[PDB]
Amino acid sequence: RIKKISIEGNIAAGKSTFVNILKQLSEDWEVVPEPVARWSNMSQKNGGNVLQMMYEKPERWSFTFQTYACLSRIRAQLASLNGKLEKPVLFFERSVYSDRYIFASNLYESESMNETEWTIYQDWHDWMNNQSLELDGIIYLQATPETCLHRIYLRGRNEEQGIPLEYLEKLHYKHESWLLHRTLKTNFDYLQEVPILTLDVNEDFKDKYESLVEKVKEFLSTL
């Protein structure tokens, strides 16, 4: 019996950092890192190609990217149900919900996907998933768009130095509608009541992470 937890947060808030932190702390704790972040500096080929494209001309490629990136996530968390794990916990790096209600939905609103692409994507999504990876909990790593902005700066990936404060602000608002106010409605009945834990990570924690983690073990003890 493996519990599944999704760790969520904006570009550069500290997800793979944190995710690599609890990694080391438990033999019963495994993580699945988001394939998009690894393409991000032969699936690596396809993955590498589509990301630069996506940046250069989102209005052309958001639909091919979002489907490929989401397919990539389903097969990764699947191959992890196997892999490992007495008191198992699987941490996901972001989820198939993130894909759709944060990134895909955002590109429609931005018009980089038209009604047709969005409507198709929505039922591919709806369908692709009805056919196991339901989550037991959600951890929300909360940071302001300016913290993420400088942390994209401490990361120094080429492509992301472009990314402007306004796109981060945009994504922040959607994480807050979804994970705090629980304002957003989904087409997945259960994700209206998945328990959620919200961690504030504006303060660095790379070597001052004990409370965060005590908070994690608590919430985990209450599932």
Next chain:
Amino acid sequence: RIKKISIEGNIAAGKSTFVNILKQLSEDWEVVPEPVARWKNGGNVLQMMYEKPERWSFTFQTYACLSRIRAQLASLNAEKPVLFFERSVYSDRYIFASNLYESESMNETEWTIYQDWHDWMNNQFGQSLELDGIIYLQATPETCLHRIYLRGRNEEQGIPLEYLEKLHYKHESWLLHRTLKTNFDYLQEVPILTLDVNEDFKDKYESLVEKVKEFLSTL
């Protein structure tokens, strides 16, 4: 129990005609017809695919092949049931997406990604969408183009002849010479039936339907 046979063939060779014909002759005989034939968003995407195919080919193929996949999964649930599909997931790939890639309307990345996906879309869900046999409706491309005009269609009245030829050779290679190799290995074995439908058969299909039965009798 429920055998699945594919009716294959170039555009307007007569596939929609033969399966409807076959459909009235036996309580054991049902069919699942390809959605592109049928073509809301499928209709916008189809229309866009005629407009700027270098833009919409990847998107159309996706939707077209999963729109097919579910349709056939929906049908899959008499004494000797036989379900004929109006083409298969293989047609989608090794006839159409192929060609479109070959014609540069998909780039390498697009192509590789689609093959990957397909590879996975039709394995995860291979539970009986797998074919028992294939019936190749064989027509000359010059025949298929009269039937293009016969069927009288908006967008269709301009199919260059040359395209139909693009589609012929691919069929012949897969279906006649059997030169074409895949990643659906079973496929390079499965019995194929080659039918000549150059002669109109709308009201003369007994010889056609005789063979289909001699054929089904050996599976």
